[PDB]
């Protein structure tokens, strides 16, 4: 679990997005695993606006941050689960690191902000939706 707060923003895993994210929809992506809600109160984060490729993440099953390498925002095959059919994410970035189920919603951060939130993984495998070619957010 786990949400990025920026100025009157929610960002979520589309898949665990809740009854309130939904009734206050501002934007969704299923092919990105993402989904954006209104909020009433200011939020704390602040996303960065860059091409970094290393950062740092947290990974709630070991209550820890690792730094990663990651891919740049691609397309990728992800296996079909409860959540969605076998199909291709978009804008995801992969790495080597710990993530097992229920690790979705761990921030990843670089110098400049948030970068992304963790979104797939599995065989010491980590993938990032990424948040940073969302300018609205800012606005
Ligand atoms: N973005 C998706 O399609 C995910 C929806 C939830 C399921 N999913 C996953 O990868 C779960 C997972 N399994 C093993 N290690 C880590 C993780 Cl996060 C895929
Ligand atoms: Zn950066």
């Given at each position: 679990?786990?949400?990025?707060?920026?100025?009157?923003?929610?960002?979520?895993?589309?898949?665990?997005?809740?009854?309130?994210?939904?009734?206050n929809?501002?934007?969704?992506?299923?092919?990105?695993?993402?989904?954006?809600?209104?909020?009433?109160?200011?939020?704390?984060?602040?996303?960065?606006?860059?091409?970094?490729?290393?950062?740092?993440?947290?990974?709630?099953?070991?209550?820890?941050?690792?730094?990663?390498?990651?891919?740049?925002?691609?397309?990728?095959?992800?296996?079909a689960?409860?959540?969605?059919?076998?199909?291709?994410?978009?804008?995801?970035?992969?790495?080597?690191?710990h993530?097992?189920?229920?690790?979705?919603?761990?921030?990843?951060?670089?110098?400049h902000?948030?970068?992304?939130?963790?979104?797939?993984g599995?065989?010491?495998?980590?993938?990032?939706?990424?948040?940073?070619?969302?300018?609205?957010?800012?606005?």
């Open positions: 679990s786990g949400a990025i707060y920026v100025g009157n923003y929610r960002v979520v895993n589309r898949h665990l997005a809740t009854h309130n994210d939904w009734a929809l501002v934007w969704e992506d299923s092919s990105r695993d993402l989904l954006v809600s209104s909020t009433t109160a200011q939020g704390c984060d602040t996303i960065a606006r860059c091409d970094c490729q290393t950062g740092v993440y947290y990974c709630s099953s070991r209550r820890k941050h690792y730094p990663v390498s990651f891919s740049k925002p691609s397309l990728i095959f992800v296996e689960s409860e959540y969605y059919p076998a199909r291709y994410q978009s804008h995801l970035m992969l790495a080597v690191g993530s097992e189920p229920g690790d979705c919603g761990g921030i990843l951060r670089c110098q902000g948030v970068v992304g939130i963790v979104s797939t599995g065989n010491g495998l980590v993938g990032f939706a990424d948040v940073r070619d969302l300018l609205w957010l800012d606005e």
